[PDB]
Amino acid sequence: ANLWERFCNWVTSTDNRLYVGWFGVIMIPTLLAATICFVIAFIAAPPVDIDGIREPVSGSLLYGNNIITGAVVPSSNAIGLHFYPIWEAASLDEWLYNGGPYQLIIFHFLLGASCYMGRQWELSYRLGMRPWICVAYSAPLASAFAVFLIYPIGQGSFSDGMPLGISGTFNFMIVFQAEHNILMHPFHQLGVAGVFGGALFCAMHGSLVTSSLIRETTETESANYGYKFGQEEETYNIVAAHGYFGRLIFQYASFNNSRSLHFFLAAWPVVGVWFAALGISTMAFNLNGFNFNHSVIDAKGNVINTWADIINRANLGMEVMHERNAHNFPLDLA
Amino acid sequence: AELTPEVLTVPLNSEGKTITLTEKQYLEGKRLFQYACASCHVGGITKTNPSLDLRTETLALATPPRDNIEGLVDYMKNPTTYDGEQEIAEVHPSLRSADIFPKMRNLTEKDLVAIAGHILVEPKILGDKWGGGKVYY
Amino acid sequence: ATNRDQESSGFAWWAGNARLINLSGKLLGAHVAHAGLIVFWAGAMTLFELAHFIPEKPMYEQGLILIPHIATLGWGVGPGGEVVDTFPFFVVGVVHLISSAVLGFGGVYHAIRGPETLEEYSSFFGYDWKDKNKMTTILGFHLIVLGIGALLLVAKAMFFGGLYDTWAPGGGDVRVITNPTLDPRVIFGYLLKSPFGGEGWIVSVNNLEDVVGGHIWIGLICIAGGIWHILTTPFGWARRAFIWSGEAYLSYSLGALSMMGFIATCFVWFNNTVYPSEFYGPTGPEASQAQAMTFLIRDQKLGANVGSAQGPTGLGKYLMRSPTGEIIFGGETMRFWDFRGPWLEPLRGPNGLDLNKIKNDIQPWQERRAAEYMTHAPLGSLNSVGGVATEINSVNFVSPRSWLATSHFVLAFFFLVGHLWHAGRARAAAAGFEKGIDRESEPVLSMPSLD
Amino acid sequence: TTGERPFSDIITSVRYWVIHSITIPALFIAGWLFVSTGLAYDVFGTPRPDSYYAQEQRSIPLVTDRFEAKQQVETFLEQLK
Amino acid sequence: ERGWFDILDDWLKRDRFVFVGWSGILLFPCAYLALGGWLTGTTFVTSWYTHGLASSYLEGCNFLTVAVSTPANSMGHSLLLLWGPEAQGDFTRWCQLGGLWTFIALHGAFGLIGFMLRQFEIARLVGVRPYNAIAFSAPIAVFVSVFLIYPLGQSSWFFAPSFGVAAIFRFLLFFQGFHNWTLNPFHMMGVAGVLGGALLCAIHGATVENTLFQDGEGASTFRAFNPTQAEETYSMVTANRFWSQIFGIAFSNKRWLHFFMLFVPVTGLWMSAIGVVGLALNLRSYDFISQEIRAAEDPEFETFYTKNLLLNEGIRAWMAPQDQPHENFVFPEEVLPRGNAL
Amino acid sequence: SYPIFTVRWVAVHTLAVPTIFFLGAIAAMQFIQR
Numbered sequence A: 001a002n003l004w005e006r007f008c009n010w011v012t013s014t015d016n017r018l019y020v021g022w023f024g025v026i027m028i029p030t031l032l033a034a035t036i037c038f039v040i041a042f043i044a045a046p047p048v049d050i051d052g053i054r055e056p057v058s059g060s061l062l063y064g065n066n067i068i069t070g071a072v073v074p075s076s077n078a079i080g081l082h083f084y085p086i087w088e089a090a091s092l093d094e095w096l097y098n099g100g101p102y103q104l105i106i107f108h109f110l111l112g113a114s115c116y117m118g119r120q121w122e123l124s125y126r127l128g129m130r131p132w133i134c135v136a137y138s139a140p141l142a143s144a145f146a147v148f149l150i151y152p153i154g155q156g157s158f159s160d161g162m163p164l165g166i167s168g169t170f171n172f173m174i175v176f177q178a179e180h181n182i183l184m185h186p187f188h189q190l191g192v193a194g195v196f197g198g199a200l201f202c203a204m205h206g207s208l209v210t211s212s213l214i215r216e217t218t219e220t221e222s223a224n225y226g227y228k229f230g231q232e233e234e235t236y237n238i239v240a241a242h243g244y245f246g247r248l249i250f251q252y253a254s255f256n257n258s259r260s261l262h263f264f265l266a267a268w269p270v271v272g273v274w275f276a277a278l279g280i281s282t283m284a285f286n287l288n289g290f291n292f293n294h295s296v297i298d299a300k301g302n303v304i305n306t307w308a309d310i311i312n313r314a315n316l317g318m319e320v321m322h323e324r325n326a327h328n329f330p331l332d333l334a
Numbered sequence B: 001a002e003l004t005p006e007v008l009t010v011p012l013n014s015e016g017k018t019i020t021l022t023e024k025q026y027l028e029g030k031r032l033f034q035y036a037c038a039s040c041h042v043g044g045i046t047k048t049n050p051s052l053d054l055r056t057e058t059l060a061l062a063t064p065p066r067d068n069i070e071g072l073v074d075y076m077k078n079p080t081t082y083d084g085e086q087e088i089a090e091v092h093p094s095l096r097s098a099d100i101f102p103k104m105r106n107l108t109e110k111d112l113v114a115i116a117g118h119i120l121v122e123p124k125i126l127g128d129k130w131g132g133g134k135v136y137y
Numbered sequence C: 001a002t003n004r005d006q007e008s009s010g011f012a013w014w015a016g017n018a019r020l021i022n023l024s025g026k027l028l029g030a031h032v033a034h035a036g037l038i039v040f041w042a043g044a045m046t047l048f049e050l051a052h053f054i055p056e057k058p059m060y061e062q063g064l065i066l067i068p069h070i071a072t073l074g075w076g077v078g079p080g081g082e083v084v085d086t087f088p089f090f091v092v093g094v095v096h097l098i099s100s101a102v103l104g105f106g107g108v109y110h111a112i113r114g115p116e117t118l119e120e121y122s123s124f125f126g127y128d129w130k131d132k133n134k135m136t137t138i139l140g141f142h143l144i145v146l147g148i149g150a151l152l153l154v155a156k157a158m159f160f161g162g163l164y165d166t167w168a169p170g171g172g173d174v175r176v177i178t179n180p181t182l183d184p185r186v187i188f189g190y191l192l193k194s195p196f197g198g199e200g201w202i203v204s205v206n207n208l209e210d211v212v213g214g215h216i217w218i219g220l221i222c223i224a225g226g227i228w229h230i231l232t233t234p235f236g237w238a239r240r241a242f243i244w245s246g247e248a249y250l251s252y253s254l255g256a257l258s259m260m261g262f263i264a265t266c267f268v269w270f271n272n273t274v275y276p277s278e279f280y281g282p283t284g285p286e287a288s289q290a291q292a293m294t295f296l297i298r299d300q301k302l303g304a305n306v307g308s309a310q311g312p313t314g315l316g317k318y319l320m321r322s323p324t325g326e327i328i329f330g331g332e333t334m335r336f337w338d339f340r341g342p343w344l345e346p347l348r349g350p351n352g353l354d355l356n357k358i359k360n361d362i363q364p365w366q367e368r369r370a371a372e373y374m375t376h377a378p379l380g381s382l383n384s385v386g387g388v389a390t391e392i393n394s395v396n397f398v399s400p401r402s403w404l405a406t407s408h409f410v411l412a413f414f415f416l417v418g419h420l421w422h423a424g425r426a427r428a429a430a431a432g433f434e435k436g437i438d439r440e441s442e443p444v445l446s447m448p449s450l451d
Numbered sequence D: 001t002t003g004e005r006p007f008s009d010i011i012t013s014v015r016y017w018v019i020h021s022i023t024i025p026a027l028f029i030a031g032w033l034f035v036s037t038g039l040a041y042d043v044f045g046t047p048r049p050d051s052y053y054a055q056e057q058r059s060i061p062l063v064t065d066r067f068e069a070k071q072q073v074e075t076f077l078e079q080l081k
Numbered sequence E: 001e002r003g004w005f006d007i008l009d010d011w012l013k014r015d016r017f018v019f020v021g022w023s024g025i026l027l028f029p030c031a032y033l034a035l036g037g038w039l040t041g042t043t044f045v046t047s048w049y050t051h052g053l054a055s056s057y058l059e060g061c062n063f064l065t066v067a068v069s070t071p072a073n074s075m076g077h078s079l080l081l082l083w084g085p086e087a088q089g090d091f092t093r094w095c096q097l098g099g100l101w102t103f104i105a106l107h108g109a110f111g112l113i114g115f116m117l118r119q120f121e122i123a124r125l126v127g128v129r130p131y132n133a134i135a136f137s138a139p140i141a142v143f144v145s146v147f148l149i150y151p152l153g154q155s156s157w158f159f160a161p162s163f164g165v166a167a168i169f170r171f172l173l174f175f176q177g178f179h180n181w182t183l184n185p186f187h188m189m190g191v192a193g194v195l196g197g198a199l200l201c202a203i204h205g206a207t208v209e210n211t212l213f214q215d216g217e218g219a220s221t222f223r224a225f226n227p228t229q230a231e232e233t234y235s236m237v238t239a240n241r242f243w244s245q246i247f248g249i250a251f252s253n254k255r256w257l258h259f260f261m262l263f264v265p266v267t268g269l270w271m272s273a274i275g276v277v278g279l280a281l282n283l284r285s286y287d288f289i290s291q292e293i294r295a296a297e298d299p300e301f302e303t304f305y306t307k308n309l310l311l312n313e314g315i316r317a318w319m320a321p322q323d324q325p326h327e328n329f330v331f332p333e334e335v336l337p338r339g340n341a342l
Numbered sequence F: 001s002y003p004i005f006t007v008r009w010v011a012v013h014t015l016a017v018p019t020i021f022f023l024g025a026i027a028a029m030q031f032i033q034r
């Protein structure tokens, strides 16, 4: 029992209140760093010249923001994709003006959250479980990579990364629609089916299981006391649930295998969010949604507008107003 | 509304002679314009120099006038600046510079007429949309 | 029907190829049949591209991804990337297509006719996944093959016509590479560059001497390690770190391929040396710089002093300073000042863009090249409408760089998911709980409670 | 089970296919002819490519009154010469 | 008493392939007509006289751009009955005037009522609690507030959503430019309920699938389950320890877990519906007055809030003339808001 | 043994019959020229 073996057994111990593990050795310092910088910057950081045109945007609470408008502002367009740690600035004041905090937060967060995915794999190994909960987490994780890293790479600048804020999120979404027509992209459409479908199946499963709870309690108590943690027997009658839902639609549209039902609940939103993530990541390289602008032409050649052309009018209004002082030449090529 | 011979009748030269194109010429002109020209001139504007468009009114005040078949066919052989003062074959696609603009190598005289005809007919169809830019999309 | 249903094998039909894990003879067939599919596509797609190819149009206006790979190797093209002979494209297509029949034949034979297992038939071609010596020997064979493959590229560059060099004086041309870079500080210095802006890690390789010399190093390294892994067996520290199973080996390769797919995505998006813009179209950064260049040229011709024109923000309308002082194009393209390309570098001085060269030395071929690349920026819709999302139909264009980057990001992403899937499963199966928790032996019931 | 004949039973029976090798193409062709005779345009009131506009007008025939809307459409339809 | 009522009751509740029930008398015609009207309209019917748009396969639209569009703004909130004073029994005029839109929306409304009566009816026959019907109140609140209350507060049905893919996208973008709907906290709660619902769905399914007991020998774990087995098929104890150690907290009560999965998406949809009721009256969360006072007086003050309003103003000015043709907006080029160069 | 005309039969055909008719109508539209 030497000191390295003692340390290894504590790191990988299944008795810690929170599991550490080898992934946790990276996860913990990187998430702490990102969290501490985020909180301080959200409250107190001075305005940031996001678009590199010497037009600083105020993101913090002390500089006139509330919870809805506040943000950690992405780093300067003059920096592009250059690495900008604190020690590359001549002073902290320079680093703050140029949006140094954004880079420090996202790089530490992406590291920590990737390790959070490994840590999910790791603990499942130590406890004797099957290993794929982390595969489900890869879908939200891939999405974070798409809006903080992949889209900056394809567009050449972290200043087009998603801001760390509520209104900054909306700004990102609107500009995205103007330049890529994401609503008309099938991968975003699959994403919407993923989350709408996930919400639907969530309420579906919850209502069916809740509707077939076996009577174990009186009317004056919560039905929740009819289940005891660790009891051997199931707490609801899946045959009754299947008999209700099979008659609601038809028999063969209803599950009677709890394992394949629960697999479907896992797979539908995960797959859908993978597609949403891949949409952002492929529109990062400007393969955009369907363009049916002026697709319908009459006999003489007049343009007959469709709803797609009305979408185009909306997108143009977003296009011409976004970053109103940032373009000198007629084409917004990135 | 229909693509009629009236629509397809355009000025042949500056002296007022008209020529009437066939539907096939018009459609061939559209295809060849997309092949050789629309990468800069989509919709009748000019992406590398938005000050000059392909509106008939703009073509009429060029030097020499370009609002007719002969003027446009000549422009595609030996393009000039708007005031006629300089020859710009070295930076604009033309038959004279087909060596450096290889897409011009397989255009025949008949093709130039059809492209020319497309440029003159389209504003009669689209109105302000032709040469108007995003405002009219 | 050996192992050909769920009862015998334990795998349902939707995991049916897992029934092949311990059937090396059928498993050999599956792999050879599949390789035939790859070689089939390469040959057939090339012939399709050739049949649809108009030599007067730029390749990148025609939806081509394979012919550009052949042209880059120096076949079929001359000065400026002009196509001089389409016959080599024909040959490459035909020979791959004919070969796929041979591979398809062996694959179909081994899959359904030959011995299902090879261990009874030949101890040389038979293998056990758990046999660490045999597994590294098969690995060593394939490293030697890969090393020969890398040296074939060197042979083409140095002895069989050369490579297309976008940087060659006079506009780009096929050039024989006579002095490949061999200094290992240069070759391996690429590996230690930051991957961030202005550095670019290995994606920044910008000259053929470094490309050819790096393949010399890679070829020798692969052949050496191939011999090393034939002669040796894994050391004790390596034995204790890995899982030794078929599924585990698959998962390591899935990890490796995912990483390579992401690198390929950035290579084709940023690099204009081994993906020449003459064939693939301009990079995104390139077209953005070309717009700035185009309007600088237009306005200067109208009499503007572009060095001293102040733009609406106070930064130069045309020119400004990078954060380290270099003179660069202005506007939103300030983010792209790391761009280097043959049409632009003649205007570059020690301090960046040189105002005297801008005023006096811009040649018409540069104005042509910047107007072409500005109007062929890699932007376009899924139905191949070229340009910004609000553009109208007219131009049938999506850049090959967008096609190659998006497809390989999608593939690399799913191959990372496959690595997680199979690495997690390989660990669980080796330890014995990939089918669930043993009720009588549930590990958590033997652990102290957390609170 | 609910007593109806299984679907897999029915659609593998020769009699099913004897009947439906006729009824299915007959319906498809009826659908084709609904369009190719131009009847679909007249039933639903949908413009043909040559009837969105009059030859020189560029204004939409937009309905602008509630209770004379029927007459407004009929007037727009006359003006097509 | 076994009269005709009871004999009909017998036939309606026969255990057949498609259950019918008393609710089926409302449900089946209304659902079928709403669906048939949408397919009929998207295949054959134009929007030329109501919107200036092509909108059917017949006109050349594809699956993304077909729609049954709303009626003309001049119809107001008219029921647009086929026998009403606008169409006067003329089926062709009715189609051209937008009669199919109210037809789909009204038969759809009663169809939805019929589906929820069906959930109650079947639940009462089988002997289960009616929580599936209670959860379906959330889709009904959404449909009623977006497709009926919202246009009823506006000038006419024209501003309701049109029934089509790209038409709904236009509806989303209209709501940003005109209502600043992303800023609305009732929408925010809806987003939380929907994304949180999707989260719960994925995480509960993956947890069950990765804490399964080994109840069989096959590598495909699906076969080792029997619908009438009494035992839980996965380990609640191991699931609880895993999540407690990964995330800090975990479910320990499986009945609470599944009630929560009902609660979260249902409550979210209900909140979003309340916000849309407000938008019916233009009672928006459009501005923060404190931001506007500061920004009016201090031309150096800029936030992501003020940036988005500029985007909204672009949306309004550039889409309004085509999107609202009955208003006859003529906006000369010189009044259109535009940044530099673009 | 089994009946032919059931409720299920009616439900199947109220959906399937118009579907085929509509698919023929939409197939014909692919050849319409302006």
Ligand code: CLA
Pocket (backbone or CB within 6 Å): C002, C003, C004, C005, C012, C013, C014, C015, C016, C017, C018, C019, C020, C023, C026, C027, C029, C030, C031, C033, C034, C101, C104, C105, C108, C111, C112
């Ligand atoms: C690249 C794709 C690929 C390849 C190479 C293979 C290969 C194989 N599969 Mg797998 N499989 C695949 C995809 C693939 N599969 C997919 C997509 C699924 C899901 C549907 C499966 C599901 C699956 C199951 C459930 C099983 C397999 C099995 C097998 C093995 C035996 C097949 C057999 O005996 O059938 C015999 C079939 C025939 C004799 C019919 C014709 C087959 C030939 C090969 C067609 C070739 C046509 C070709 C054009 C001829 C060219 C000849 C010319 C070159 C001269 C074989 C090695 C089996 C196995 O593991 O056994 C141990 C098995 O049980 N597969």
Ligand code: CLA
Pocket (backbone or CB within 6 Å): C013, C014, C015, C016, C017, C018, C250, C254, C414, C415, C416, C417, C418, C419, C421, C422, C425
């Ligand atoms: C070199 C790559 C490679 C190889 C050799 C394998 C091999 C295997 N995989 Mg793995 N896998 C991989 C990559 C690979 N995988 C990747 C990249 C992923 C992420 C998506 C996975 C995710 C995965 C899962 C989740 C599972 C496996 C499983 C398996 C085993 C059974 C596979 C089977 O029979 O499928 C049969 C093939 C099919 C049923 C066909 C799938 C159809 C796909 C989805 C169509 C894709 C669409 C197509 C690209 C385009 C549309 C086509 C359309 C228009 C016609 C086998 C050992 C199984 C296992 O664990 O066994 C131990 C299993 O459960 N794999």
Ligand code: CLA
Pocket (backbone or CB within 6 Å): A271, C045, C048, C049, C052, C062, C063, C064, C065, C382, C384, C400, C403, C404, C407, C410, C414
């Ligand atoms: C590396 C892969 C790759 C890339 C980058 C390209 C790129 C291109 N192809 Mg090529 N091609 C490929 C593979 C590729 N192809 C393959 C495998 C085939 C045989 C099927 C072809 C056969 C082919 C033909 C016949 C043609 C092209 C053409 C083209 C050009 C136009 C593409 C287009 O319009 O797509 C349209 C876009 C789509 C069809 C989108 C597909 C979406 C898929 C189905 C989603 C799949 C996601 C994932 C794989 C599934 C995951 C499922 C999950 C459960 C795990 C473009 C340069 C055209 C051209 O211009 O030739 C000169 C042309 O005519 N290609």
Ligand code: CLA
Pocket (backbone or CB within 6 Å): C028, C032, C102, C103, C105, C106, C107, C109, C110, C114, C115, C118, C121, C122, C125
């Ligand atoms: C990597 C692929 C691969 C591997 C490992 C094997 C392995 C085997 N094959 Mg199979 N086979 C393959 C591909 C492969 N084959 C192909 C492509 C075909 C169609 C031509 C066949 C058709 C085939 C038949 C008809 C038979 C076998 C048999 C065998 C077994 C004995 C072979 C032997 O001892 O040859 C000794 C070695 C040689 C004769 C040297 C051959 C050198 C080749 C021909 C020249 C090229 C070398 C160079 C590396 C090729 C580069 C190709 C690259 C560009 C792709 C052995 C297990 C036999 C068997 O199964 O017994 C029951 C058998 O009867 N194979």
Ligand code: CLA
Pocket (backbone or CB within 6 Å): C136, C139, C143, C191, C192, C221, C222, C224, C225, C226, C228, C229, C232, C233, C234, C235, C238
């Ligand atoms: C496909 C190619 C391949 C594969 C699969 C293997 C596989 C193996 N090698 Mg072999 N090897 C190869 C090629 C390959 N080798 C080549 C070309 C050479 C000649 C250079 C060698 C020379 C060699 C030696 C001398 C040894 C091995 C050993 C081994 C075994 C242990 C590997 C290990 O622990 O890596 C894990 C990797 C490390 C421990 C590296 C350090 C960890 C760093 C920090 C990770 C950095 C990752 C980072 C993201 C890098 C990004 C890029 C970077 C360059 C900037 C394993 C069986 C060992 C063995 O057991 O021999 C029998 C051993 O001693 N190999």
Ligand code: HEC
Pocket (backbone or CB within 6 Å): B033, B036, B037, B038, B039, B040, B041, B046, B048, B049, B052, B053, B054, B055, B058, B059, B062, B066, B072, B075, B076, B080, B081, B082, B088, B092, B093, B115, C371, C372, C375
């Ligand atoms: C970008 C590389 C271009 C392509 C391809 C084509 N044109 Fe062009 N055109 C371009 C520019 C920059 C200009 C202005 C030239 C100047 O400095 O004066 C033009 C001009 C024209 C004109 C004159 C328009 C006018 O109002 O006088 C015409 C008639 C014209 N271009 C036609 C034309 C044709 C027919 C093309 C395909 C063969 C074509 N252009 C391609 C830029 C580019």
Ligand SMILES: CC1=C(/C=C/C(C)=C/C=C/C(C)=C/C=C/C=C(C)/C=C/C=C(C)/C=C/C2=C(C)CCCC2(C)C)C(C)(C)CCC1
Pocket (backbone or CB within 6 Å): C029, C030, C033, C034, C036, C037, C040, C094, C097, C098, C100, C101, C103, C104, C105, C107, C108, C111
């Ligand atoms: C195993 C298996 C499988 C798979 C298989 C495979 C994958 C196969 C492959 C195969 C292949 C891979 C094949 C190939 C073949 C080829 C061929 C057969 C070719 C031919 C060619 C020719 C004949 C040519 C011609 C020509 C010329 C020469 C010139 C030009 C023109 C032309 C083109 C005409 C599956 C999945 C099904 C399942 C079962 C099992």
Ligand SMILES: CC1=C(/C=C/C(C)=C/C=C/C(C)=C/C=C/C=C(C)/C=C/C=C(C)/C=C/C2=C(C)CCCC2(C)C)C(C)(C)CCC1
Pocket (backbone or CB within 6 Å): C186, C187, C188, C190, C191, C202, C205, C210, C211, C212, C214, C215, C217, C218, C241
């Ligand atoms: C060709 C070329 C070149 C060169 C190149 C080179 C030279 C390369 C190299 C490369 C290399 C040389 C690479 C390497 C890699 C490595 C890796 C990738 C590793 C990994 C690792 C791992 C993965 C591990 C893991 C682990 C851990 C960490 C712990 C324990 C356990 C385990 C083992 C699991 C140049 C650029 C000049 C130019 C162009 C061309």
Ligand SMILES: CC1=C(/C=C/C(C)=C/C=C/C(C)=C/C=C/C=C(C)/C=C/C=C(C)/C=C/C2=C(C)CCCC2(C)C)C(C)(C)CCC1
Pocket (backbone or CB within 6 Å): E032, E033, E035, E036, E037, E038, E039, E040, F014, F015, F018, F019, F022, F023
């Ligand atoms: C309105 C109205 C009415 C009614 C009518 C009806 C009732 C109709 C129906 C109709 C119908 C009932 C129709 C249908 C149609 C269908 C269709 C048109 C379909 C199509 C399909 C498809 C196209 C598919 C596709 C796909 C998908 C989706 C996915 C999978 C794969 C695939 C690709 C296959 C009446 C007379 C009463 C009165 C007046 C008004």
Ligand SMILES: [Cl-]
Pocket (backbone or CB within 6 Å): A326, A327, A328, A329, C330, C331, C332, C333
């Ligand atoms: Cl700009």
